[PDB]
Amino acid sequence: MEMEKEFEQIDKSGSWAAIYQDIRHEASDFPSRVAKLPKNKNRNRYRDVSPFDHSRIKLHQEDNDYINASLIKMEEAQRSYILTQGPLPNTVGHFWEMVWEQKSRGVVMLNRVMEKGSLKCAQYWPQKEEKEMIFEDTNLKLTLISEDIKSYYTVRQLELENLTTQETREILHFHYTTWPDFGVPESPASFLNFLFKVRESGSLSPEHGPVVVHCSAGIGRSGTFCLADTCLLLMDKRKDPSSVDIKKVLLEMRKFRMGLIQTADQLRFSYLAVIEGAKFIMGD
Ligand SMILES: O=C(O)c1cc(Cl)nc(Cl)c1
């Protein structure tokens, strides 16, 4: 079926939970043996969210190459994404090593450091220009260059230096700051505006390594971001945009990381975002 009318048909019939459970039943199951080794317990935020072995990002280190991060490679859309958990106190240096080694330009953050009164990720970037951060375990230096605070998101320019080689690179930090503590946003308008700002920066383009996107577990809000992006790109590429099947795209993405899209409300929000976004792209 088309998307917008399949949407109204699920709303009127109140079957979002049944649609979402079908996706969970059909989703791929692949081994995640490296994630579960005992030496990696303090590298995982949640015991039930692990990267598959076949798609995990490897650190370029001979001691321990493990990080809870997955490469989602979308062949028809010609987009790649790295989805990862919010960094932990003992993985902030691994996080920036990955950014460096994979040649990423941008980092997309969809959570606040504290939500619901608890810490959802480490404070992994510097908050003042004159107070840079050094990560001694991976030999990197990170400096805040500039910061632009808007009503729904903040954009930061950062400098990452490889202290071994003295090479430097500019990284863009795109921080969506207004996702609610419970539920999903009422309108997708600010999320789409944010997605378009990431696109306009070049961070999603083939001349750079894959964008790094995270929330707390790296599957829920993060899944919504890449699913909406890929679906809109396919609608631009194809002769028949109504052929884009959001449930099939989600199942394809779940071959590369488990659990993408965590609730039936997130599934409904993804439909809403793609539907509204397809109108703004055009033509009109
Ligand atoms: O390239 C394709 O796979 C494809 C598939 C569908 Cl269903 N529609 C178009 Cl236009 C292209």
UniProtKB/Swiss-Prot annotation:
Expressed in keratinocytes (at protein level). One of its GO terms (cellular component) is cytoplasm. The lineage of its organism: Eukaryota, Metazoa, Chordata, Craniata, Vertebrata. Keywords: Acetylation, Endoplasmic reticulum, Hydrolase, Membrane, Oxidation, Phosphoprotein, Protein phosphatase, S-nitrosylation. The modification S-nitrosocysteine is found at residue 215. The modification Cysteine sulfenic acid (-SOH) is found at residue 215. Tyrosine-protein phosphatase which acts as a regulator of endoplasmic reticulum unfolded protein response. Mediates dephosphorylation of EIF2AK3/PERK; inactivating the protein kinase activity of EIF2AK3/PERK. May play an important role in CKII- and p60c-src-induced signal transduction cascades. May regulate the EFNA5-EPHA3 signaling pathway which modulates cell reorganization and cell-cell repulsion. May also regulate the hepatocyte growth factor receptor signaling pathway through dephosphorylation of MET. Interacts with EPHA3 (phosphorylated); dephosphorylates EPHA3 and may regulate its trafficking and function. Interacts with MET. Interacts with NCK1. The modification N-acetylmethionine is found at residue 1. It is found in: Endoplasmic reticulum membrane. Its main location: endoplasmic reticulum. This is Tyrosine-protein phosphatase non-receptor type 1. Substrate binds at residues 181, 215-221, 262. The keyword Metal-binding does not apply.
